[PDB]
Write an enzyme that holds these catalytic residues in place. Structure first.
Site, PDB file in Angstrom:
ATOM      1  N   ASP A 181       0.875  -1.163   0.000  1.00  9.08           N
ATOM      2  CA  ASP A 181       0.000   0.000   0.000  1.00  9.08           C
ATOM      3  C   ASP A 181       0.926   1.231   0.000  1.00  9.08           C
ATOM      4  O   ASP A 181       1.437   1.637   1.037  1.00  9.08           O
ATOM      5  CB  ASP A 181      -0.880  -0.088   1.239  1.00  9.08           C
ATOM      6  N   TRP A 218       5.464  -3.877   7.913  1.00  7.51           N
ATOM      7  CA  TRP A 218       4.485  -4.967   7.872  1.00  7.51           C
ATOM      8  C   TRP A 218       5.088  -6.105   7.009  1.00  7.51           C
ATOM      9  O   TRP A 218       6.030  -5.866   6.253  1.00  7.51           O
ATOM     10  CB  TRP A 218       3.072  -4.478   7.422  1.00  7.51           C
ATOM     11  N   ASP A 267       9.206   0.834   4.232  1.00  4.60           N
ATOM     12  CA  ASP A 267       9.049   2.107   3.564  1.00  4.60           C
ATOM     13  C   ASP A 267      10.418   2.783   3.490  1.00  4.60           C
ATOM     14  O   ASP A 267      11.356   2.430   4.225  1.00  4.60           O
ATOM     15  CB  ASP A 267       8.100   3.006   4.364  1.00  4.60           C
ATOM     16  N   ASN A 316      -1.403  -2.899   6.620  1.00  2.59           N
ATOM     17  CA  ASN A 316      -0.750  -1.953   5.715  1.00  2.59           C
ATOM     18  C   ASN A 316      -1.473  -0.583   5.557  1.00  2.59           C
ATOM     19  O   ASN A 316      -1.122   0.171   4.668  1.00  2.59           O
ATOM     20  CB  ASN A 316      -0.416  -2.593   4.359  1.00  2.59           C
ATOM     21  N   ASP A 317      -2.441  -0.283   6.433  1.00  3.19           N
ATOM     22  CA  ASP A 317      -3.145   1.019   6.449  1.00  3.19           C
ATOM     23  C   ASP A 317      -2.484   1.992   7.413  1.00  3.19           C
ATOM     24  O   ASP A 317      -3.060   3.052   7.715  1.00  3.19           O
ATOM     25  CB  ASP A 317      -4.635   0.882   6.805  1.00  3.19           C
ATOM     26  N   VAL A 318      -1.283   1.651   7.910  1.00  2.00           N
ATOM     27  CA  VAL A 318      -0.487   2.520   8.746  1.00  2.00           C
ATOM     28  C   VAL A 318       0.825   2.843   8.040  1.00  2.00           C
ATOM     29  O   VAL A 318       1.268   2.156   7.128  1.00  2.00           O
ATOM     30  CB  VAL A 318      -0.239   1.925  10.147  1.00  2.00           C
TER      31      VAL A 318
END
Ligand SMILES: NCCc1c[nH]c2ccccc12
Ligand SMILES: NCCc1c[nH]c2ccccc12
Lengths: 361, 119, 360, 109
Positions: B24, B49, B68, B96-98
């Site tokens: 993401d 993640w 990242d 993966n929304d963080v």
């Protein structure tokens, strides 16, 4: 098996690199420089420049200079105007140089953020809104002082035949020349005679810059010249870019960084559009015209691809054009330019592109 | 299939590339880096993640770590949002929304990738 | 002779206002809240929220609370995580409240930034990446409690039947309940029995929240419930959203803020899509299903308009849905929702819309 | 009509029209502050056939509105005629210089 690492240098050599200054006007607090390889269109990296960044590369090719504004809480809190020095190959921040809180905030004309020919001083436009020119001593990492003599003037045109001299365009239609001392303070100055009528034939600020002279185009398609081969600048013009047919269809210049000069040939490049009238001076190029500045005649005309800004590389005989989002690469080694490729989506809102310097001593 | 640097750039820069199955964000390989190197001037996250992706080329399943690169503003290129085996924040390291740059010296998110850990 | 003035208030009444949290993911350092009038689509104003802002409106309707991160030089320098208090009518900044530098950075699920029912405490999710819940005392303007007991849990579900109580979803598949004292420190806590299997039937975190119970949907289309009418939460489920025809076409839920509850009827609203399989839990809605939570059966289904997130207004019987960019307004006074209008271009990258509170 | 770039009073706007941003043609949206300084345009009134002076004050201290972007250049001149120039931020001297939107304030004939 694999490990993600940082600390890497830009993958393509300096001579392949260009810098697209993305204002990101819709989100102007997140402006940035996009670094591209002009030979294949590859994205190479970027430099964040906060609110309305401006950018140039050091004349020696080693560093990228940005100019920007911060506040402690972005939309509130204390203002800090700065120049930043970044490593060109690592694209990392090295040094911040404090400015008075009046650096120009505006679209990215070249002449708002320049350097002396010798690379020793950064020379930038201030507006408080009173205008002055700011001088930054690169070796010291310091702001020197305002060039207050430049009140009522606008933009910086370095003189490539002197180490630390530049000119600016004044409200009287003449040019002010400033000569700096080794400490970056004004050592001397001079003001030209009137070059153009501010009321009747206003010029675009972007110079077509030669080693010892500069040409400027006007709203109505005239050309003016400033010769600085001597200590005193001599001014001339107008001559017209336009033949009879051109005048009949009301062709006039338009754009932002809208001209360029190929020094070896004396060819001048200009964005032009038909049906000119009051209010069309920033219209996209219908065509690019290529003028012989010696014979004062056009030698070529090609499709403009809606370009607004350009830049010329003297060492590789290239011209880049930019329409706000896409960059076109041209070979200008002959009178008629040849399109080599287009880089799509290089920016969201850019009006300035620049090459990484090669040579230029 | 295990060595993106030997592969077709367009293949690894696709959201459909097998190892990008829970990405993401913007692929670092489109941002001036590669699958396993941050673009110049951005810093890897020390945390990430994780999860597995199936390699259809060799038929095996691999552990992937989605680090990242941090400290530069959004790259903006090759945005992906794939969710194979992704779970909510009560399974935090599968989520993966963080922002996995959240513990870096500078948390600004630049791009993401998929590092192959093992079988 | 005209004069330009500042100092003006929002031009439409509070009851008309909605808040579209635009992450602006492409330029995430310039996230913002866009304020719209849902009755006519008019843009009313905005609140800048820097890097990955979160937003909520105070329960009394007077203030807007934002949560965000700053750095001295944006991409370098010292970090400051904050809650900001803004006036709701003037859309002006009033106060900053300092947080420890671990507030959650992530997409805008409602449960990451909430408040107690009595409005006296802001309750926010931290991740360092170890998780904890942070408590901000609004009156004092201070971070007053860090609930480390919530380690391994995620998100905040306020209990509307108690003044300062909330629940969180834990890695054991149960719920942890925290009851705050009037000082904002933990006064008591409890853990439920396992509600769902984390491995076999994970739930979406978004609650369908009633006054004394909450419902949750799962990745495979099941429903779990947590009854908090007592001090101890009682948990149950699953029941399936799906009938045999639904199962044949592999319908499952998908989205972000993907469920809602109309409290007067017990109707639950869920985004659903066909051809579900591993990895489709964030797919846009093909349909909105309307479920009767008392009979545990579907009552209606309508086109989903590719929506991803929703919210409900109880007193006006409205549902908003959001596809990332556009907001759809529905009347839910009857079992079949009726589309009233669409607000196009409300955001570039929003996964959260909220109404201005009108209940007080 | 006032939300259109072609409205006569907007003849030297380079920016977002405040009337699309929660303000009006002559008032800043809530929580944004007017610039004390401005560039000026001379615009032709299509009703009476006369030219009017329009003062383009920016509204400042909030990030870009992003709605109703206009770029009109009637009688606009470069920075050597500074107060006729619209390629600069007229919020440059405000407490916070972040540019939100632009107003079009009629001064007179
Ligand atoms: N009044 C608009 C000036 C403007 C155009 N482009 C810009 C970029 C940055 C700052 C100002 C501008
Ligand atoms: N790993 C990407 C997390 C993410 C998705 N949307 C966001 C918005 C804000 C911050 C993080 C995110």
């Amino acid at each position: 098996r694999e490990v993600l690492t940082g600390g890497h240098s830009v993958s393509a050599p300096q001579e392949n690199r260009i810098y697209v200054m993305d204002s990101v006007f819709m989100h102007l607090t997140e402006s940035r420089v996009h670094v591209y390889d002009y030979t294949n269109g590859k994205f190479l990296g970027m430099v964040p420049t906060a609110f309305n960044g401006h950018v140039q590369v050091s004349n020696d090719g080693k560093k990228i200079y940005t100019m920007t504004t911060y506040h402690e809480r972005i939309t509130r809190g204390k203002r800090s105007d700065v120049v930043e020095v970044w490593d060109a190959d690592k694209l990392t921040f090295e040094k911040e140089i404090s400015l008075p809180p009046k650096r120009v905030q505006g679209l990215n004309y070249d002449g708002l953020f320049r350097q002396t020919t010798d690379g020793k001083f950064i020379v930038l436009q201030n507006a408080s809104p009173a205008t002055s020119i700011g001088i930054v001593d690169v070796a010291k990492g310091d702001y020197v002082e305002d060039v207050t003599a430049a009140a009522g003037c606008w933009s910086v045109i370095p003189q490539p035949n002197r180490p630390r001299s530049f000119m600016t365009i004044c409200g009287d239609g003449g040019l002010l020349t400033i000569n700096l001392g080794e400490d970056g303070k004004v050592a001397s100055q001079s003001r030209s005679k009137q070059m153009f009528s501010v009321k009747d034939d206003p010029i675009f600020i972007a110079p077509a810059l030669d080693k010892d002279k500069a040409h400027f185009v006007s709203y109505y398609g005239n050309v003016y010249s400033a010769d600085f081969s001597g200590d005193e600048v001599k001014v001339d013009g107008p001559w017209s870019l336009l033949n009879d047919e051109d005048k009949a269809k009301n062709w006039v210049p338009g754009g932002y960084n809208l001209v360029g000069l190929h020094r070896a040939s004396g060819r001048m490049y200009v964005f032009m559009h038909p049906d000119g009238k009051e209010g069309t001076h920033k219209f996209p190029a219908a065509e690019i015209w290529v003028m012989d500045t010696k014979t004062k005649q056009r030698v070529a005309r090609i499709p403009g691809r809606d370009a607004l800004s350009m830049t010329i590389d003297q060492q590789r005989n290239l011209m880049l054009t930019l329409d706000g989002g896409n960059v076109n690469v041209y070979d200008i080694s002959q009178p008629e330019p040849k399109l080599l490729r287009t880089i799509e989506g290089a920016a969201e809102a850019s009006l300035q592109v620049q090459f990484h310097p090669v040579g230029g001593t | 299939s295990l060595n993106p640097d030997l592969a077709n750039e367009d293949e690894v820069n696709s959201c459909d590339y097998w190892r990008h199955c829970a990405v993401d964000g913007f692929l670092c390989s489109c941002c001036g880096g590669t699958t396993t190197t941050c673009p110049p001037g951005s810093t890897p996250s020390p945390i990430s993640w994780i999860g597995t992706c199936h390699n259809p080329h060799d038929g095996k399943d691999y552990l992937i770590s989605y680090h990242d690169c941090c400290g530069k503003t959004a790259c903006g290129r090759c945005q992906c949002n794939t969710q194979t085996r992704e779970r909510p924040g009560y399974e935090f390291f599968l989520h993966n929304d963080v922002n996995w740059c959240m513990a870096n010296e500078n948390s600004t998110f630049h791009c993401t990738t998929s590092v192959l850990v093992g079988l």
